[PDB]
Design an enzyme around this catalytic site. Structure first.
Site, PDB file in Angstrom:
ATOM      1  N   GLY A  49       2.712  -3.033   9.940  1.00 25.28           N
ATOM      2  CA  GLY A  49       2.117  -4.189  10.587  1.00 25.28           C
ATOM      3  C   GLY A  49       2.096  -5.457   9.747  1.00 25.28           C
ATOM      4  O   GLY A  49       2.776  -5.550   8.723  1.00 25.28           O
ATOM      5  N   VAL A 102      -4.223   2.813   8.889  1.00 24.17           N
ATOM      6  CA  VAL A 102      -4.699   1.784   7.963  1.00 24.17           C
ATOM      7  C   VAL A 102      -4.621   0.378   8.556  1.00 24.17           C
ATOM      8  O   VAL A 102      -5.491  -0.460   8.316  1.00 24.17           O
ATOM      9  CB  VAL A 102      -3.879   1.846   6.653  1.00 24.17           C
ATOM     10  CG1 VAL A 102      -4.364   0.810   5.632  1.00 24.17           C
ATOM     11  CG2 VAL A 102      -3.939   3.256   6.073  1.00 24.17           C
ATOM     12  N   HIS A 135     -14.937  -1.316   9.760  1.00 23.30           N
ATOM     13  CA  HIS A 135     -14.335  -1.918   8.570  1.00 23.30           C
ATOM     14  C   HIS A 135     -13.968  -3.368   8.891  1.00 23.30           C
ATOM     15  O   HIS A 135     -12.991  -3.637   9.607  1.00 23.30           O
ATOM     16  CB  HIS A 135     -13.075  -1.155   8.168  1.00 23.30           C
ATOM     17  CG  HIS A 135     -12.375  -1.719   6.967  1.00 23.30           C
ATOM     18  ND1 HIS A 135     -12.933  -1.704   5.705  1.00 23.30           N
ATOM     19  CD2 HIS A 135     -11.154  -2.290   6.830  1.00 23.30           C
ATOM     20  CE1 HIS A 135     -12.088  -2.248   4.845  1.00 23.30           C
ATOM     21  NE2 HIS A 135     -11.000  -2.613   5.503  1.00 23.30           N
ATOM     22  N   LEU A 145      -8.891   4.397   7.858  1.00 26.08           N
ATOM     23  CA  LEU A 145      -9.449   4.013   6.571  1.00 26.08           C
ATOM     24  C   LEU A 145     -10.539   2.955   6.750  1.00 26.08           C
ATOM     25  O   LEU A 145     -10.376   2.002   7.512  1.00 26.08           O
ATOM     26  CB  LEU A 145      -8.347   3.423   5.668  1.00 26.08           C
ATOM     27  CG  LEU A 145      -8.869   2.741   4.398  1.00 26.08           C
ATOM     28  CD1 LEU A 145      -9.463   3.788   3.442  1.00 26.08           C
ATOM     29  CD2 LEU A 145      -7.780   1.943   3.677  1.00 26.08           C
ATOM     30  N   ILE A 187       0.839  -1.201   0.000  1.00 27.99           N
ATOM     31  CA  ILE A 187       0.000   0.000   0.000  1.00 27.99           C
ATOM     32  C   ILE A 187       0.874   1.252   0.000  1.00 27.99           C
ATOM     33  O   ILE A 187       0.600   2.198  -0.719  1.00 27.99           O
ATOM     34  CB  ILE A 187      -0.990   0.011   1.180  1.00 27.99           C
ATOM     35  CG1 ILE A 187      -1.976  -1.145   1.035  1.00 27.99           C
ATOM     36  CG2 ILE A 187      -1.722   1.379   1.265  1.00 27.99           C
ATOM     37  CD1 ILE A 187      -2.937  -1.288   2.204  1.00 27.99           C
TER      38      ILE A 187
HETATM   39  N1  LIG Z   1      -8.027  -0.092   6.704  1.00 28.10           N
HETATM   40  C1  LIG Z   1      -8.241  -0.711   5.539  1.00 28.10           C
HETATM   41  O1  LIG Z   1      -9.408  -0.476   4.781  1.00 28.10           O
HETATM   42  C2  LIG Z   1      -7.209  -1.676   5.025  1.00 28.10           C
HETATM   43  C3  LIG Z   1      -6.171  -2.045   5.861  1.00 28.10           C
HETATM   44  N2  LIG Z   1      -5.140  -2.808   5.403  1.00 28.10           N
HETATM   45  C4  LIG Z   1      -4.073  -3.150   6.357  1.00 28.10           C
HETATM   46  O2  LIG Z   1      -2.958  -2.313   6.133  1.00 28.10           O
HETATM   47  C5  LIG Z   1      -1.778  -2.985   6.535  1.00 28.10           C
HETATM   48  C6  LIG Z   1      -0.718  -2.851   5.435  1.00 28.10           C
HETATM   49  O3  LIG Z   1      -1.053  -3.518   4.234  1.00 28.10           O
HETATM   50  P1  LIG Z   1       0.077  -3.782   3.114  1.00 28.10           P
HETATM   51  O4  LIG Z   1       0.792  -2.536   2.753  1.00 28.10           O
HETATM   52  O5  LIG Z   1      -0.557  -4.578   2.038  1.00 28.10           O
HETATM   53  O6  LIG Z   1       1.060  -4.740   3.958  1.00 28.10           O
HETATM   54  P2  LIG Z   1       2.624  -4.993   3.681  1.00 28.10           P
HETATM   55  O7  LIG Z   1       3.010  -6.200   4.450  1.00 28.10           O
HETATM   56  O8  LIG Z   1       2.977  -5.098   2.194  1.00 28.10           O
HETATM   57  O9  LIG Z   1       3.349  -3.712   4.342  1.00 28.10           O
HETATM   58  C7  LIG Z   1       3.497  -3.575   5.743  1.00 28.10           C
HETATM   59  C8  LIG Z   1       4.885  -2.988   6.024  1.00 28.10           C
HETATM   60  O10 LIG Z   1       4.996  -2.508   7.352  1.00 28.10           O
HETATM   61  C9  LIG Z   1       6.338  -2.707   7.766  1.00 28.10           C
HETATM   62  N3  LIG Z   1       6.486  -2.518   9.225  1.00 28.10           N
HETATM   63  C10 LIG Z   1       6.381  -3.418  10.260  1.00 28.10           C
HETATM   64  N4  LIG Z   1       6.607  -2.764  11.430  1.00 28.10           N
HETATM   65  C11 LIG Z   1       6.858  -1.457  11.157  1.00 28.10           C
HETATM   66  C12 LIG Z   1       7.149  -0.339  11.946  1.00 28.10           C
HETATM   67  N5  LIG Z   1       7.256  -0.403  13.277  1.00 28.10           N
HETATM   68  N6  LIG Z   1       7.351   0.870  11.333  1.00 28.10           N
HETATM   69  C13 LIG Z   1       7.277   0.995   9.959  1.00 28.10           C
HETATM   70  N7  LIG Z   1       7.000  -0.109   9.187  1.00 28.10           N
HETATM   71  C14 LIG Z   1       6.787  -1.304   9.778  1.00 28.10           C
HETATM   72  C15 LIG Z   1       6.693  -4.084   7.205  1.00 28.10           C
HETATM   73  O11 LIG Z   1       8.086  -4.279   7.057  1.00 28.10           O
HETATM   74  C16 LIG Z   1       6.010  -4.012   5.842  1.00 28.10           C
HETATM   75  O12 LIG Z   1       6.907  -3.522   4.860  1.00 28.10           O
HETATM   76  C17 LIG Z   1      -2.204  -4.419   6.864  1.00 28.10           C
HETATM   77  O13 LIG Z   1      -2.447  -4.539   8.254  1.00 28.10           O
HETATM   78  C18 LIG Z   1      -3.548  -4.561   6.190  1.00 28.10           C
HETATM   79  O14 LIG Z   1      -4.376  -5.497   6.852  1.00 28.10           O
HETATM   80  C19 LIG Z   1      -5.095  -3.228   4.103  1.00 28.10           C
HETATM   81  C20 LIG Z   1      -6.124  -2.867   3.234  1.00 28.10           C
HETATM   82  C21 LIG Z   1      -7.183  -2.084   3.696  1.00 28.10           C
HETATM   83  O1  LIG Z   2     -10.560  -4.339   2.646  1.00 23.57           O
HETATM   84  C1  LIG Z   2      -9.453  -4.536   2.177  1.00 23.57           C
HETATM   85  O2  LIG Z   2      -9.175  -4.181   0.930  1.00 23.57           O
HETATM   86  C2  LIG Z   2      -8.387  -5.203   2.960  1.00 23.57           C
HETATM   87  N1  LIG Z   2      -7.420  -5.990   2.487  1.00 23.57           N
HETATM   88  S1  LIG Z   2      -6.533  -6.642   3.717  1.00 23.57           S
HETATM   89  N2  LIG Z   2      -7.213  -5.774   4.946  1.00 23.57           N
HETATM   90  C3  LIG Z   2      -8.236  -5.098   4.429  1.00 23.57           C
HETATM   91  O3  LIG Z   2      -9.123  -4.295   5.296  1.00 23.57           O
END
Ligand SMILES: NC(=O)C1=CN([C@@H]2O[C@H](COP(=O)(O)OP(=O)(O)OC[C@H]3O[C@@H](n4cnc5c(N)ncnc54)[C@H](O)[C@@H]3O)[C@@H](O)[C@H]2O)C=CC1
Ligand SMILES: O=C(O)c1nsnc1O
Ligand SMILES: NC(=O)C1=CN([C@@H]2O[C@H](COP(=O)(O)OP(=O)(O)OC[C@H]3O[C@@H](n4cnc5c(N)ncnc54)[C@H](O)[C@@H]3O)[C@@H](O)[C@H]2O)C=CC1
Ligand SMILES: NC(=O)C1=CN([C@@H]2O[C@H](COP(=O)(O)OP(=O)(O)OC[C@H]3O[C@@H](n4cnc5c(N)ncnc54)[C@H](O)[C@@H]3O)[C@@H](O)[C@H]2O)C=CC1
Ligand SMILES: NC(=O)C1=CN([C@@H]2O[C@H](COP(=O)(O)OP(=O)(O)OC[C@H]3O[C@@H](n4cnc5c(N)ncnc54)[C@H](O)[C@@H]3O)[C@@H](O)[C@H]2O)C=CC1
Ligand SMILES: O=C(O)c1nsnc1O
Ligand SMILES: O=C(O)c1nsnc1O
Ligand SMILES: O=C(O)c1nsnc1O
Lengths: 315, 315, 315, 315
Positions: free
Chosen positions: B79, B123, B180, B148, B13
């Site tokens: 995370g 997020v 969410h 988000l 992201i």
């Molecule tokens: N709120 C929403 O509607 C949504 C939430 N998410 C959540 O967002 C999060 C991120 O998703 P992605 O980017 O796809 O995951 P990703 O795994 O590709 O990126 C997460 C990054 O955070 C890093 N990280 C771990 N601890 C850290 C710290 N203390 N400081 C800085 N970086 C750190 C990791 O090394 C990794 O690069 C996940 O928890 C996912 O579930 C994803 C989609 C939608």
């Molecule tokens: O809703 C989403 O797109 C999503 N992918 S992983 N975590 C989430 O909330």
């Protein structure tokens, strides 16, 4: 009706391209790949951005070659990113040759059958070789197929100089020709800043010749620098390809350096090489030949010789 | 001077966000992560697109928390994406709880010290829990932090309906509230097409109640659908976050559904939940309370109860 | 190849339209007018903005009707802005009837001969009358000609409400139907803010019924308000027309309120009236009939009756 | 919070500027003028376009100088467009001198009092004279005030060459310096196409020296050509001013040719003249001195001498 843009290859570069196409509302997108289901997943995710972008572009996945039917533009990234076995230290685009050759032939046959009138952009490395192979097997006219190279290579050179001079990146213009790879030819004489010869800035001690030499080296080795830090470059390559595709689709007539069939320019024929071209509604509308000096020509010749060497090994 | 936008987390992201920020020339970007070198590599790649985009935004990588200093906007994706051990079939955001909790506390302390006046977007899942935890530990005002949720969830609902009705995606408006996750509350009564109640289109047999029920189910399960096809969603989430960040930075005052501190709305206090808010220069300028009926309120209560359940386990 | 857009009438609205077309790179532009040389002068001035806009649209002037040949879109503003003799206090669109009627017939004949497949947008007042007259004389299909009205009228209503509520103007949606003029029908029941019924904001005392009545009156009298301050409105009318033309050219499928041929909707046939339509590649792809109550229908009937009254005087 | 942009003068150029500011969402706009009510009328019309543009910029009219308070950018078009008495054949910017001088003094006093920290762009002719007069009376730093000239003059030269060569207008870069008026200095040596010296295209017979001479003459006489066809140019001037204002507001650091205080460049001091400058957050961040030859310098001297001649008559 909207243009149909088929991305043959739905990996890292394909994903950024689909995203940018929706952002710019450029046309409907098909993410095609041999990997099952993955393209459908990326397409679904990407399709939702139509809302945030105020756009209306369909984004669909595909595992079927005949979905090339009706394509207006075809972008080919299909292939290998690294010789399965070589370290990141020792990468080299040349090693992708044996891995990507047969793939161009297969794709070419499907293009000839399904969309012989499409405009083709080839990305797969080594690009100057792969583009000609696809040209030969797809049967498309020479004005309808080009390869990615100079727009991407010069973005780095332009960017690095703009950082040193503290000016808008787009205000630096520069030319890199011959081939996309370690033999790329950087033309110091053809660099400008706000349309002004870079030499004036050197005369004023705003940037030195030594600083420029370091930027030149950094430019050639950028892909390697990124891999030694992360992975194969994909964001800037994608943006470069979209700038090219957009010029065609909207008849912008931008001057952009791309790999194209040479027919005597620089003394070369029967090979593709990087040179400024004009991209508009009719594809490659103009091929511009830079009036290189003998020293610059010698370097251009070295680049073409390397393309020829690899072309022979692909056969 | 340009806004400074720090992306705390440089994964999937984070990468799309950096790309979109440069496309829109929104401000300087810092890609921060705990992983060595990777953020520097992504930053380098992304920086070159300034040329193609006609923009002038610095993009830099970071492994140092104090680079949060001077941040105008902070976006937290840091995370885990999946419980290391659970299959893709059985995903669930709830399982990310134990993996992401301590991370919010650490980040909050660094925000309090380095950029107490920044606007924060959270997020990390489960988002309605994580956002409140970050609020409590960062010490920022309630009008300066949101999570988000609704912009992303509704993009899917809006998109799917627009496909069936053959209208511009942005012309469908809809509301999903509470939380969410699997308890998200889809409000059928509040859907419009070109500002017209969706019920009129149902009356005209242009779309049926049964078709809408299927779209509702698809909407709730979209993240799962994509994982069963590819991977955790990242392109649409990123676009949703940028729409939010842009509204703040440019004082657009868009009505966008986000997770925010409830102070009596819907009968709830001392918890964050999803509801339409107005985002402008002063952060959360308005919290809009939908005049829900008792049946809708009952579903909202179920969503809040699940946030509370997970909040307790995070402590 | 680029779309060809012919502006039949190169006065105030025509000038803003040409400017906006270049800003958006929408297509080549012809500024046509009966006045000698003036269109050539405006075209020259406007053409230079291609540089500042990063666009590539030809802008040419014309005094020759056959330059309509090859037109993809034709926009008609040709005619009178005021009864030569009436004060600004007593303006009224009805008085433009005798001044603009013969002009539609002449233009229609040239369209039938030169560009029978073009998409036509009529602006000349009284628009609901003039559009049908042009339809009858140009011979184009009913899905290929519309009149300006609701996009412009609602922009004012949407804007004024957004100012009071302190939200993004685009987040207010509203419907004005029947006809463009003093009998325009403002539908209070169909106003939303961020997709939420305006009544909820009234219940919350964020805006009162009395305030809305004043906004309604201001909306109907806006053209008059501007004339009593300056001149016939031209900037917003132009932007409204371009939003319509853009939806067609790029197949956006936006829901936009325009004057279109009624074939039983609201109980009316054989007349044009304002109603939400969907504009895409095939022109008017859908005509949406609002499910009006009897009180709203009565007002719609009054609007249609006025169009019919003026239609009779034009013959 | 949004930037506040005050347009001192609400005539033709002011109207296009307000329109473009809303299109680009650049900031709140005040249309100020001495004419009663007119600015309020234009402001009202323009404000409605926020809807069509997806923007949120206030547009207000003003007849009160103290509304300059809080201005971030001030654009001055106030003054006369033609010597009341001279024909269109015999126009000349020099004749505007006696008509516009006292106006700069009055405006300068109000700027010093109300917005001493604003960035100022002067348009009123003869611009190289009027800008220095406003500089002296407003008391603002030399890096905070510039005059319109080269961006506008070069847009014409760039455009005309792009038409002949069939390339994207923005791909032609060129320099016109010294002063904005009949003594403008066109630098043939500094023209490029896609970053390539124009001389290469001349060598290739793609464009001839004779064709370029005609384009040069057309460029100098463009304002006159338009007046002999229509009226004082306003659309391209406005777009040029907005490109300048945008570079400042968004810290783009574009290289743009503008009138600025010379402090030894080209051998000149204590006068304003046209030269490439870099515009960013700190105003005029860099003044670039072209390394002109003696023949080019002689022409630059002629331009400065004319500015000095008129400066003396204004006193
Ligand atoms: N709120 C929403 O509607 C949504 C939430 N998410 C959540 O967002 C999060 C991120 O998703 P992605 O980017 O796809 O995951 P990703 O795994 O590709 O990126 C997460 C990054 O955070 C890093 N990280 C771990 N601890 C850290 C710290 N203390 N400081 C800085 N970086 C750190 C990791 O090394 C990794 O690069 C996940 O928890 C996912 O579930 C994803 C989609 C939608
Ligand atoms: O809703 C989403 O797109 C999503 N992918 S992983 N975590 C989430 O909330
Ligand atoms: N020309 C240039 O300036 C640059 C070229 N490249 C090259 O582009 C290529 C793609 O790069 P990435 O997207 O990063 O690689 P990637 O590995 O992420 O994507 C390649 C995709 O092609 C697919 N594929 C394999 N055979 C296929 C076939 N027959 N049809 C359709 N898809 C097929 C693979 O499954 C994979 O998903 C690489 O060869 C890389 O070296 C990369 C950057 C720049
Ligand atoms: N439908 C709507 O919501 C609105 C309609 N209008 C109407 O649009 C019309 C145009 O408005 P403006 O541009 O402000 O008026 P304008 O007077 O500035 O321009 C009208 C132009 O049409 C030209 N013309 C006359 N006969 C012609 C012909 N046969 N062919 C080509 N050109 C011809 C005139 O020379 C003049 O230049 C007016 O009738 C006005 O009432 C204006 C605003 C909104
Ligand atoms: N620098 C350049 O490259 C160019 C300069 N110009 C110059 O810009 C000026 C404006 O051009 P247009 O907008 O076409 O003229 P315009 O006549 O349409 O507008 C000038 C406005 O200034 C107003 N005004 C007079 N005194 C004022 C005061 N004290 N405060 C505020 N407003 C006042 C007038 O009422 C009028 O509305 C002219 O002098 C023209 O020669 C025009 C084009 C290019
Ligand atoms: O140059 C590049 O960005 C690149 N990455 S992998 N292959 C390439 O040509
Ligand atoms: O509504 C308007 O803006 C208008 N100005 S003159 N004629 C019109 O319909
Ligand atoms: O150059 C111009 O466009 C112009 N029109 S009137 N005054 C000017 O400088």
């Amino acid at each position: 009706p909207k243009a149909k843009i088929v991305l043959v290859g739905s990996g890292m570069i394909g994903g950024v391209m689909a995203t940018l196409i929706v952002q710019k509302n450029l046309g409907d997108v098909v993410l095609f790949d041999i990997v099952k289901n993955m393209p459908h997943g990326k397409a679904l995710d990407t399709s939702h951005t139509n809302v945030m972008a105020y756009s209306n572009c369909k984004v669909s996945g595909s595992n079927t070659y005949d979905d090339l039917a009706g394509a207006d533009v075809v972008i080919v990234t299909a292939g290998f990113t690294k010789a399965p076995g070589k370290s990141d230290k020792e990468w080299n685009r040349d090693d992708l040759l044996p891995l990507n050759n047969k793939i161009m032939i297969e794709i070419g046959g499907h293009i000839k059958k399904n969309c012989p009138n499409a405009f083709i952009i080839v990305v797969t490395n080594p690009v100057d070789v792969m583009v000609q192979l696809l040209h030969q097997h797809s049967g498309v006219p020479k004005n309808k197929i080009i390869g990615l190279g100079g727009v991407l290579d010069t973005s780095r050179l332009k960017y690095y100089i703009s950082q040193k001079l503290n000016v808008c990146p787009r205000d630096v213009n520069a030319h890199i020709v011959g081939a996309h790879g370690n033999k790329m030819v950087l033309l110091k004489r053809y660099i400008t800043v706000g349309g002004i010869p870079l030499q004036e800035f050197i005369n004023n001690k705003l940037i030195s010749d030594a600083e420029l030499e370091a930027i030149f080296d950094r430019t050639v080795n950028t892909a390697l620098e990124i891999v030694n830090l992360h992975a194969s470059p994909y964001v800037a390559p994608a943006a470069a390809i979209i700038e090219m595709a957009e010029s065609y689709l909207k008849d912008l007539k931008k001057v952009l350096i791309c790999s194209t069939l040479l027919e005597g320019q620089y003394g070369h024929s029967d090979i593709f090489g990087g040179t400024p071209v004009v991209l508009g509604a009719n594809g490659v509308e103009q091929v511009i030949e830079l009036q290189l000096n003998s020293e610059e020509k010698a370097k251009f010749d070295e680049a073409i010789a390397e393309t020829k060497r690899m072309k022979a090994l692909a056969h």
